[PDB]
Write a protein that binds this ligand. Structure first.
Ligand SMILES: CCCCCCCCCCCCCCCC(=O)OC[C@H](COP(=O)(O)OC[C@@H](O)CO)OC(=O)CCCCCCCCCCCCCCC
Ligand SMILES: CCCCCCCCCCCCCCCC(=O)OC[C@H](COP(=O)(O)OC[C@@H](O)CO)OC(=O)CCCCCCCCCCCCCCC
Ligand SMILES: CCCCCCCCCCCCCCCC(=O)OC[C@H](COP(=O)(O)OC[C@@H](O)CO)OC(=O)CCCCCCCCCCCCCCC
Ligand SMILES: CCCCCCCCCCCCCCCC(=O)OC[C@H](COP(=O)(O)OC[C@@H](O)CO)OC(=O)CCCCCCCCCCCCCCC
Ligand SMILES: CCCCCCCCCCCCCCCC(=O)OC[C@H](COP(=O)(O)OC[C@@H](O)CO)OC(=O)CCCCCCCCCCCCCCC
Ligand SMILES: CCCCCCCCCCCCCCCC(=O)OC[C@H](COP(=O)(O)OC[C@@H](O)CO)OC(=O)CCCCCCCCCCCCCCC
Ligand SMILES: CCCCCCCCCCCCCCCC(=O)OC[C@H](COP(=O)(O)OC[C@@H](O)CO)OC(=O)CCCCCCCCCCCCCCC
Ligand SMILES: CCCCCCCCCCCCCCCC(=O)OC[C@H](COP(=O)(O)OC[C@@H](O)CO)OC(=O)CCCCCCCCCCCCCCC
Ligand SMILES: CCCCCCCCCCCCCCCC(=O)OC[C@H](COP(=O)(O)OC[C@@H](O)CO)OC(=O)CCCCCCCCCCCCCCC
Ligand SMILES: CCCCCCCCCCCCCCCC(=O)OC[C@H](COP(=O)(O)OC[C@@H](O)CO)OC(=O)CCCCCCCCCCCCCCC
Ligand SMILES: CCCCCCCCCCCCCCCC(=O)OC[C@H](COP(=O)(O)OC[C@@H](O)CO)OC(=O)CCCCCCCCCCCCCCC
Ligand SMILES: CCCCCCCCCCCCCCCC(=O)OC[C@H](COP(=O)(O)OC[C@@H](O)CO)OC(=O)CCCCCCCCCCCCCCC
Ligand SMILES: CCCCCCCCCCCCCCCC(=O)OC[C@H](COP(=O)(O)OC[C@@H](O)CO)OC(=O)CCCCCCCCCCCCCCC
Lengths: 69, 69, 69, 69, 69, 69, 69, 69, 69, 69, 69, 69, 69, 69, 69, 69, 69, 69, 69, 69
């Protein structure tokens, strides 16, 4: 596909924000949720799942650009 | 069918945008939704479903042109 | 990614609070839970798991910044 | 981390209560449980485990402040 | 720690009851258990263990106050 | 806080009933439950837990007034 | 607390029944359970535990009235 | 306590059956168990324990009525 | 922010009631719920959670004023 | 964009009220809702979500001014 | 309050029926439900809960008249 | 209460059926369930519980009429 | 506010009926609903909620007169 | 604005009635609705919402006079 | 009770089947289970328990008719 | 069946990815899960099950093409 | 029935696609789901169920043509 | 299979981390668990099992690449 | 493998603590357990096993780094 | 290893108590056990084993510090 056009700025902003401040806020939210739900049931596997989700978000732009040319 | 006519430009724009900036914006939206809903309930299966939907969108023009000659 | 923008202040507050007062409150909550659940079934392994979770929270900002540039 | 902020009072109360009246109540609960479960199966090792848990609670604030700056 | 506060009365009651009527009831329960289990297998070592547990309960408040300031 | 106002009567009634007839009914309910569940599995520890809950209810008004000024 | 009010009759009935017909039915149930489970594994300690539970039920009203004024 | 009321008939039936047909069936069950388990390991002490349990059942109503007035 | 204006009286009333009669009524409601749900499943951890919620309500005005200037 | 014009006063009032008395009233409403819904199901995660929403409201004017120049 | 007026007859009928034929029908329904659900999972605690609900219904008119003068 | 009225026939039918054909069908159902679940895990205690439930059903009308006048 | 005027009689009637015959009818309706829904799922907590609602209705006139002068 | 003029009497009457007899009638209507809808689904949160609406009505004149000079 | 009515045929069928073909099938199932579980752990006591259960089923109709008139 | 058509590209991508990067990511996820859950309960049988699942995925395309011609 | 008509082409396409590219895509989806859900809970029975579903899809056209002539 | 594509980076990161910092953290966790559970029950066989699991993790990438081409 | 990355600090802390204060605490715990269990059954072989476990912990980092490159 | 850190105080307390009051209490316990078990079977070899265990405890800190640097 083409990255430019009438919606090029929106796509650029969303792609940059996926690994930018909103993405970091979401990742911190998952970290806080893992810490909170581990108070009664300590489970560090959810931390690994959160790290994997962060890795997926880090590669989200690449995946989207690969699937949608 | 025929790709030209009075509505040929609209069809061309929509087909190009399916894998263009609007399609990439929608895919980034699904990625953001997967990241957000994984804060409380980490689920990477929805990421696989999102990737499959992106693959379907990448082949949407081919499917439409195959069904509608 | 970029730490600034419209959501830079929210990200800064969340990152500082991960090891700040809310994070310390959550850690004290896990300590209280470990103490309480050890009344009937004394288990100091959950204390080690809680310490590991505290260590993970101490490095949460670094992990998030590493995954999300 | 920082001990002050909007949640500074909650953190201060929880840290003081870890070795305060609630912590002493929990420790007395473990002592009562050790005494009760020793009626049929006298086991003074659980008393040592309870003392170790009390020692951990006495150092809980230090551990939390060390892990979370 | 501090013995006063919202939970000061509960802590005072529990500490007084550790060597009070509930503690004496538990100690009498261990004595009855030692007498009963000695019908088929006479074992006076369990009586010594019960006496040691009673001594521990007599010093439980001191231990709790020493560990939790 | 303030004990008076439009909701002062409701607060007074609830605080008096916490140690009044409804609280005594709830405590008798826990006693009945302890007696019933001890038919198949005799467990006098639940009686101690029930006594501790009764002690907490006896101090519930004090705790609420201490936390909420 | 106060024994009268809208719930005074319910509290009176429950307190009287704790040592009345329902309490005697529950005690007979524990006696039947002790007799039945002693067919394969004769254990008279459970009879002592049942007697202690009956003694606790006999003093349940006093304990409730002492904790809840 | 009071033997009458809505549950008086149930209490009367249970008390009469403790030394009635169900109690005799349970006692015969213990006798059969003692005879069966003595085939490989002849042990007449379990017969004495069974006789003591029968004596306890014979006095179960008296014990229940003494504890629960 | 500013505490005055057309809605200053409403904000003042709500902030005072957070630790006033309505807040005390809600806290007594949580105490009653903890007592009631402990009849069948005695759990004193919910009492600790209720105390933590009361502490949060005691600092709710401070948190709101800190976040919203 | 431009903050002045025929609608400049309305925009100024709304932006000031986002962190002013109406915003504080809404935040107190979320605190009251968290306290009320925690009576039956104690959940302190909703308190964290409410704090995050308060933080978002504190930065709402900045986000709006960043997106809309 | 006042028991007379335009709605006095309806209130009288409802209060009399609370312990009358409709109330007895509802109580028999709970007895039937307890008997039916005990076929697969025999549980006599639900019978005690049903008896307590019947006792509450017997005092429902008194409670209503006490709360609503 | 009163046994007559518009719902007197329904109450009479339900009370008669509690010990009539539907009650006997339910009791036979519990007997069948006890026999079936004893194929893999022979347990005659559930038979005693079923007999107690049958005794309760036999006195259900008396209990209902005693609680609801 | 003022209790008199063209609508003074309507306000007086409604305030008197809040704790009068209509209010008692509504309270009896909640009691009937609690009894009915407890046939399949015995829950006495809803009875406590109904009692709290009755207490609120008993103080409804006071609350209305306090808020609306 | 100005409170006098040809419509000054109408404005005065409406402002006085907002907290007068019509406002009290409306508040009693919300109380009756909360009581009625709580018969099947007991919900005391709607009572809090009604109290907040009453508080808003108590300050309605102030808000109107602040917005409209 | 009465054996006739709308449910008389169902009761007759169930009572006849308790000692009929379904009851014999269940008894054969217990015999097969005893034979199978005795392959690794030969235990003829379970055969005695199965015979006692068969005897109980043979008298199930009599017990049901005695309890439920 | 036929591998071509409008959906031929999607089928080709999914079949290649079953043993490609997504399949390898899933297999690494199972390896990580086996390693993590073996920290507390070391179990190498789950590793064998994971290897069998990897073997099944390696033959998944063949199985699908065999069943669906 | 008849395979021809106005809808003959649609029926032919659907029947061919049941074992064609869409059916293979669905089967690959079940394989991916089995692989993914086996990361935390390795279960190869779901693979057998998926194979059975693939076999059913392979015979779906035959079943449809047999039922609908 | 193919190691490249849209998910090539995720696969590379996971494969490198299997023997990298996360894998070493998991191995240290198993070592800590072996040391902790050996305090009461010294068992060095679990150390051998942990070493075997570490060896399996060291060869996990090779196994995955062998099964999934 | 690589010792650095987002999880490098956690790995460094865990490796240093294996032979640091937590490891020494665990070793002292095994020494205390050996001393305590030797009161009734003096066994110095468990001391040798504890020394071997301490030696294994001293080489745990080397083993982990050797297996996981 | 390092003796300081978040767990330095716990390690210091445990090391000092190994030869302190708890260690002396354990040694006195072994002496009492040796004296008691020598009543029927006088054996002074167990005294030598106890002395060797005391010597091991005296050197426990040195051994732990030597193995764990
Ligand atoms: C006041 C005295 C000092 C506090 C003493 C105890 C503190 C509680 C911790 C020990 C309880 C352990 C046994 C629990 C018994 C139990 O079953 O708990 C159940 C309850 C619900 O937790 P989850 O939602 O994880 O549970 C789901 C199910 O378990 C429901 O039962 O757990 C908690 O709420 C405790 C965690 C709160 C701890 C984190 C608090 C920090 C976050 C909030 C910070 C403030 C937010 C402010 C926003 C403005
Ligand atoms: C009044 C007389 C003095 C008290 C005497 C006994 C005190 C109880 C301790 C010994 C019982 C041991 C045998 C138990 C038998 C048993 O099975 O218990 C079961 C019960 C449930 O505990 P968990 O939820 O850990 O158990 C889950 C399963 O075990 C359920 O059975 O344990 C407790 O509640 C005891 C711990 C409370 C002790 C900590 C209390 C301090 C926290 C609360 C402080 C106040 C909060 C105020 C909030 C406003
Ligand atoms: C009435 C006559 C005087 C009492 C005579 C005997 C008293 C019982 C002691 C000897 C029995 C020994 C053989 C037991 C045979 C046996 O197997 O017991 C089993 C039973 C269950 O105990 P655990 O839960 O420790 O056992 C778990 C498993 O052993 C289950 O079998 O043990 C007890 O309940 C006895 C301890 C109660 C003793 C402590 C009572 C004091 C706490 C309660 C104080 C009142 C609370 C009031 C709350 C309102
Ligand atoms: C009439 C004879 C004297 C009463 C004898 C027995 C009383 C019941 C207690 C022992 C039963 C134990 C075994 C239960 C078996 C069981 O499974 O129960 C289940 C039932 C439901 O409780 P939860 O909702 O906690 O349970 C959720 C799940 O467990 C559902 O199964 O528990 C209760 O209702 C008992 C608690 C009521 C006790 C508190 C009553 C006081 C509050 C009401 C006061 C009056 C309100 C008036 C409003 C106008
Ligand atoms: C009719 C003949 C005379 C009765 C003979 C036997 C009576 C039963 C006692 C011995 C059985 C022991 C072996 C059981 C075998 C067994 O596994 O039982 C399981 C069953 C379920 O009890 P729980 O809910 O404690 O058990 C949970 C799990 O154990 C489920 O298996 O226990 C009972 O129901 C027995 C307790 C009832 C005894 C208390 C009855 C008094 C309360 C009701 C009073 C009337 C209420 C009226 C309301 C209107
Ligand atoms: C028909 C021939 C005459 C009977 C001969 C033998 C009778 C059985 C006694 C000796 C077996 C000993 C070896 C058992 C081998 C064995 O392992 O048994 C296991 C089985 C299960 O008992 P528990 O639940 O105590 O065992 C739990 C675990 O041991 C499970 O294995 O024990 C019984 O059921 C025997 C007790 C029944 C005896 C009491 C019966 C009276 C109560 C029922 C009265 C009728 C109720 C009617 C309700 C409507
Ligand atoms: C009169 C006697 C003294 C009161 C005794 C009991 C008080 C109730 C608390 C314990 C019940 C626990 C078991 C409940 C059983 C249960 O399932 O409850 C269900 C019911 C509905 O709550 P939610 O909407 O959270 O539940 C949604 C679902 O759970 C529906 O079932 O919970 C409540 O209403 C209780 C909370 C009220 C407590 C807060 C009251 C304070 C707010 C109102 C203040 C006055 C407003 C005035 C406005 C003018
Ligand atoms: C970044 C560091 C390297 C990763 C380290 C760890 C990786 C995680 C595996 C071990 C965690 C084990 C303990 C879990 C603890 C646990 O309870 O997990 C719960 C969580 C939810 O799984 P389910 O939905 O099967 O669980 C349902 C319930 O278990 C909810 O708790 O499991 C997973 O998400 C792990 C499986 C993901 C593994 C497959 C990932 C590959 C698919 C995605 C590929 C990318 C898609 C891209 C789309 C664009
Ligand atoms: C690295 C150094 C060379 C290895 C040295 C030792 C190897 C371990 C054998 C001796 C330990 C004996 C004492 C154990 C102490 C012990 O209690 O073990 C407990 C542990 C759990 O086994 P189970 O599940 O049979 O035990 C259930 C309960 O025993 C739990 O305690 O046993 C094993 O895991 C050992 C068997 C693994 C041996 C088979 C491994 C081959 C299968 C895996 C092949 C690779 C799969 C790859 C998949 C991708
Ligand atoms: C690749 C190397 C060669 C394989 C080596 C090992 C093969 C695994 C067998 C030994 C593991 C034993 C220890 C297990 C440890 C263990 O706990 O396992 C747990 C796991 C779950 O089994 P269940 O669901 O029976 O277990 C329920 C609970 O046990 C959960 O833990 O068991 C299996 O999956 C093994 C059975 C699969 C064996 C049957 C496979 C054939 C069916 C599939 C055929 C293909 C379907 C294709 C569909 C398209
Ligand atoms: C800070 C001091 C240094 C750490 C000391 C101890 C470390 C803990 C290991 C020994 C505890 C053994 C006794 C446990 C007592 C126990 O019962 O544990 C229970 C707890 C829950 O584990 P599972 O979910 O396997 O257990 C299910 C049930 O066992 C629940 O009880 O186990 C763990 O969490 C320990 C495994 C974590 C170890 C792996 C950590 C590496 C993965 C995370 C890496 C970071 C992720 C970052 C994401 C951003
Ligand atoms: C540091 C000083 C040099 C070591 C001196 C002594 C070494 C210990 C041998 C003699 C003790 C004999 C009396 C024991 C007294 C005794 O009762 O022991 C009990 C203990 C438990 O063994 P089992 O599980 O066979 O016993 C089950 C029951 O006996 C439990 O009591 O035995 C061992 O652990 C000793 C065998 C370890 C020897 C094999 C070690 C090699 C495998 C581990 C290699 C490293 C793995 C690294 C993984 C990363
Ligand atoms: C204060 C005085 C100095 C301490 C004296 C005694 C220390 C205890 C050791 C000897 C007791 C032996 C007899 C026990 C009797 C017994 O049965 O214990 C049972 C208890 C439970 O252990 P497991 O979970 O292995 O046991 C499972 C079953 O055995 C449950 O009974 O064992 C321990 O907790 C002792 C191990 C703790 C030792 C390791 C502590 C170091 C890890 C924690 C470091 C701090 C974490 C901080 C996190 C922030």
């Amino acid at each position: 596909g083409s990255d430019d056009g009438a919606f090029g700025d929106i796509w650029a902003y969303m792609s940059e924000a996926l690994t930018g401040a909103p993405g970091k806020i979401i990742a911190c939210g998952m970290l806080f949720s893992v810490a909170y739900f581990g108070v009664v049931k300590p489970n560090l596997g959810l931390a690994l799942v959160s790290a994997l989700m962060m890795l997926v978000m880090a590669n989200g732009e690449k995946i989207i650009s690969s699937f949608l040319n």
